Write a protein that binds this ligand. Structure first.
Ligand SMILES: *CCC(=O)N1CCC[C@@H](n2nc(-c3cn(-c4cc(Br)ccc4O)nn3)c3c(N)ncnc32)C1
Length: 256
């Protein structure tokens, strides 16, 4: 469907000129304001003259995003605008990603935040795999989006390993392979060295350390199925525990 903007159930007919460009957030992703209501959204622009490889990837991801309306852990699309020269994809405006939150924090991200993040990411990967046969496998702090409402969603679409590395980086503030100078050197350390587990002297719960250890299983045959990973006590704890991610997000973004 094209030519419509749906923000919270209210459906509006709209064209690209009904949006005011508030600047690049960076492909190109704009922050735009819907003049009719004042709502602010994220808009991804795909140029018809663009690279064939980049456009093909954009259209594949949009196909999944349009089918993922029933997953609360995937960034939602509000509508599309097709012009003679461009395609404008209206997405819900998130705050920032976990990589930038780590940079503003200038230190480890608390376990209670990573607990809610873990529950959101795993259920997004399981949804993508179960409902659409998509194997993401490329989870990193730059793909995990958060907003001031406390929401945690995936964007920009074997998977268990990259989640474990992302959790170790965010829990320690240190990327486990920061001293590798090439991509091949990273692959050698992944295969030759023991998995980079969580430190034991940072007050991490046994559930958190167990979950990261299960994610960083080198033998692919020994990695758990999703129905097993969704039963891990670390997932069970933060499925129900009250964690004020929204207030923590605002406090971190208030840092200079
Ligand atoms: C880690 C955070 C960061 O540095 N960036 C770069 C600038 C844009 C930021 N950002 N991206 C989105 C977004 C992207 N997509 C998307 C849609 C399709 Br269809 C295909 C591929 C992608 O990546 N949806 N949403 C952002 C949103 N929605 N809000 C705020 N910032 C966003 C990420």
């Amino acid at each position: 469907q094209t030519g419509y903007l749906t923000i919270g159930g209210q459906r509006y007919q709209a064209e690209i000129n009904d949006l005011e460009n508030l600047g690049e957030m960076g492909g190109q992703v704009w922050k735009m304001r819907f003049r009719k209501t004042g709502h602010v959204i994220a808009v991804k622009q795909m140029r018809r003259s663009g690279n064939k490889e980049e456009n093909k990837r954009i259209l594949m991801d949009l196909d999944v995003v349009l089918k993922s309306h029933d997953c609360p852990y995937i960034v939602q699309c509000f509508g599309t605008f097709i012009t003679n020269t461009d395609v404008f994809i209206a997405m819900e405006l998130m705050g920032t990603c976990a990589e930038k939150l780590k940079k503003r924090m200038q230190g480890p991200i608390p376990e209670r935040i990573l607990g809610k993040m873990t529950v959101a990411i795993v259920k997004a990967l399981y949804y993508l795999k179960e409902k659409h046969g998509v194997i993401h496998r490329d989870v990193k702090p730059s793909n995990i989006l958060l907003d001031e409402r406390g929401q945690i969603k995936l964007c920009d679409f074997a998977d268990v390993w990259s989640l474990g590395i992302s959790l170790v980086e965010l829990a320690t503030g240190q990327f486990p392979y920061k001293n590798c100078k090439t991509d091949f050197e990273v692959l050698t350390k992944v295969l030759q060295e023991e998995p980079p587990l969580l430190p034991g002297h940072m007050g991490f719960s046994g559930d958190f350390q167990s979950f990261v250890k299960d994610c960083l299983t080198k033998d692919h045959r020994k990695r758990p199925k999703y129905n097993k990973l969704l039963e891990h006590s670390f997932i069970k704890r933060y499925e129900t525990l009250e964690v004020d991610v929204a207030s923590w997000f605002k406090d971190v973004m208030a840092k200079t």
